[model samples]
Target chain A: GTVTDDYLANNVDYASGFKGPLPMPPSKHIAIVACMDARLDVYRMLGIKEGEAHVIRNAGCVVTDDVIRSLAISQRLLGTREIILLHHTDCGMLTFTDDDFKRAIQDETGIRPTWSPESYPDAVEDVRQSLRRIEVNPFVTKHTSLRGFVFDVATGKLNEVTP
Target chain B: GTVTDDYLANNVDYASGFKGPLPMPPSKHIAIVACMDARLDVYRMLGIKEGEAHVIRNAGCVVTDDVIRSLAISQRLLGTREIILLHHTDCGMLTFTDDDFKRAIQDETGIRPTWSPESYPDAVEDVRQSLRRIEVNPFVTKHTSLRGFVFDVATGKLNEVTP
Candidate 1:
């Protein structure tokens, strides 16, 4: 059986004990933007109870326009008012340069990617950059508290990054 | 106290028992695209162990260029080979039309969003659309398995969406 089958079976187990259909808006009135790293479990790392926060994640947790779109919906449509951005140590985004990655894809596919890979060398600096992206965004303007952090993979500690 | 402060406190507890620094590539070689719905905890619902899969989430889990970018990075840069798309019942995307949402934003901010809000009327159909987007994308072609599911909020079960 494929791994998909395994997850399907696991879902059955989850459904057996499930008590859900929670409210749409985040109960904690917060949204988290985190890296899509395999090891970074944003919910568990922040002790986020289900239905408490709008968790928007992507590669490197960069603040791209798509992220802004999600944040707009989260704040404008829903009621989330606080924002947190999480990057981490040993992230894949740190290992490559944006140009090189894009060139590689273009060489293979014969079509260059229109989007930026958004690779960064420093996790802390990238966290700060993500914070600035949000700060300057007009659409994602409803947050009362905005913070950025670099999660230490080894210790699992989130070190706050000052802009 | 702000919720961010509370999460910082919770992070301390998470770090106390943390055992991480796992490999950068997903051990299970899988990636998930799920909605940024507060109630759908993708990891728990699928019983995904940390370090097993890359989870990319957004406003609707709709496969936009950004989602494709993430998936491309997932398959090309990382080693993920399985793709899963998840949309859920009572999604915020279904509550409004893309044009209406954009018009409201334009009326408020005086700048219409360049990007589509990607609102859809049906969850199952959107799941199919997401799956098809993956199939057509040249960059995200490394997947051995691709499936879509509509996660039921009331029961916590993921119902498979057949394309």
Candidate 2:
């Protein structure tokens, strides 16, 4: 509570005062699936202006069914066509294998989840996997513009992954 | 690939060069599930510093099994216990019902999804539903702190929701 109070106190100064009656659909007709890594700021890294595209963040930037669900909505309802999957280097997802992490979580919370966060050891391979997921998802419009990039946390560069 | 060339060109200039060897878990002991609207830069809007909290983003920032699945990992694996589900004003999710959107996608993509994207008719009700979802989910810690908010896209203010 105290921390949040301090956050709120400081937030007033930084809060965006820009008026935006931004439209419902994305302006750029694209979507991004990327890691929720605190180190990466999608807007700053990708140079995305506000209201341009949908930015989906999950651990590992892995394309889960939920991601497809959002993309279905994005393309069908809101009018987006491109898919960009941005995975990064030195991701925590690479630190723990799913089996060990799942067991560790079960031991802590007493519930075994049926879902996996889809962690991978290799960042480039994870990008390919995300690309594959987007390609195979029937809800995603076929022949959509798609690409995957590995954001280098060390050097701050995006290396394209061949799919 | 012109976009890539241009982005990489600009990347060299805006690149953070951040010097981050930050630790694994969020330092703030909090997690934020918020909308994927490109305009709503969660880090800047919420005034979240790097490595401070987990920010899980998706369309409408709605709570799904995947969200709970992610939250479970956030709390159980990482060291965070608070959940903040944030929706916003004038969202695309409010523009149409899932059935309409789903059917439209079926017409466009030739496949109707088994899962609903979980669109809502009203924004505020959506916040309560998200809050309710977190409170009842078994994977989430019992009696842990929870709150939902509506981020005003126009004003940059967060209006808290009551469960």
Candidate 3:
């Protein structure tokens, strides 16, 4: 049976406009590397606050040249000591073959495949490869720790992939 | 010209094993709510810790009843105060129409569409609608702040969607 109900609003309290500035700055300077997919909400999933962590997002969440450079700077200057890598399930990055991307590009602008480093393996493999890149990159301090995990879109669960 | 590389073994230590116990439990616990797509790597994207954040992924990253229930638990017991909402470009959830899902499910399972509450919608409108749902939820403490952003999958950039 469907139930229909309506509630009454008896009083109005509109005096509370805004509060003062936050009490303190975040002590922990953590960093997050996730994908640019519209479906993910990193803050709510992690439950964080302003000034608590630095979030860096990219396609497929792969750490490319720019990602490495950013990480080097963040680690050296921002006091970030740990890294988390998250990849999701059923990502569009998995659906498109290299040929598909090439065809789409050609359809839009009559250009052929350029054979850039951007044309790497699939998303999961790309993430795994990127993890190694960041781990061994001399620019990233050796003391810093790195971890990888896969988020299931169907089940809403996080599973660790790397040690 | 193509370059070929040879593999060589190095005497440098390869295995360092796990570090000692964490100093203090994560002061800021972050929960990521994102789509189930496999292409997104939340860890590398955010640069977080293995045990630091709890990631909850779903189709379209929508805040369903289950998500709210989980958030309530995380906040009341696990200590969370902030929420970051992320949506990405070229999501498969955006490609197909609602009728497509219904038709596909019917074809596969021989079950007629029931117009269930869990029925999914197109991505753009879905995300905008999700923000409204999150804002109006009474259980999610009024003091908790919410920030929404859109991630461009192709260019790998994040733009603030909500002020």
Q: Which candidate gets the maximum lDDT versus the true structure?
A: 1
Arranged by DockQ with the best first, the candidates are 1, 2, 3
Worst 10 residues of 3 chain B by lDDT: B2-11
Ranking by lDDT: 1, 2, 3
Instruction: Specify the CAPRI tier of model 3.
Output: incorrect
* Best model number under TM-score: 1
Clash pairs, candidate 1, are: none
Q: Assess every candidate by TM-score.
A: 0.98, 0.91, 0.42
Q: Candidate 3, B47: how far from true, in Å?
A: 24
Tell me the TM-score of candidate 1's A chain.
0.97
How good is the docking of model 2, as DockQ?
0.57
Candidate 3: tens digits of C-alpha lDDT, residues B9-120: 1101111222223321123444455543333334434544444544544444657554554454345434556555666665545444556655655675475444322324
lDDT by residue for model 3 (A1-163), tens: 1000000010011112212232121234455676544344454445443335545554456565445544543454445666667676665356445566556546654764343213344556666876887776655552345766665554444555653
Model 1 achieves a DockQ score of 0.86
Question: Residue B91 of model 1: what lDDT?
Answer: 83
Task: Please provide, for model 1 over B13-125, each residue's C-alpha lDDT reduced to its tens digit, 9 standing for 90 to 100.
Answer: 99999997798999999999998889989899999998999999999997877788888888988889999889999988878998999999989988888888889999999
Q: How large a fraction of the reference contact set does each model reproduce?
A: 0.83, 0.53, 0.00
Q: Which of 1 and 3 is the better model by DockQ?
A: 1
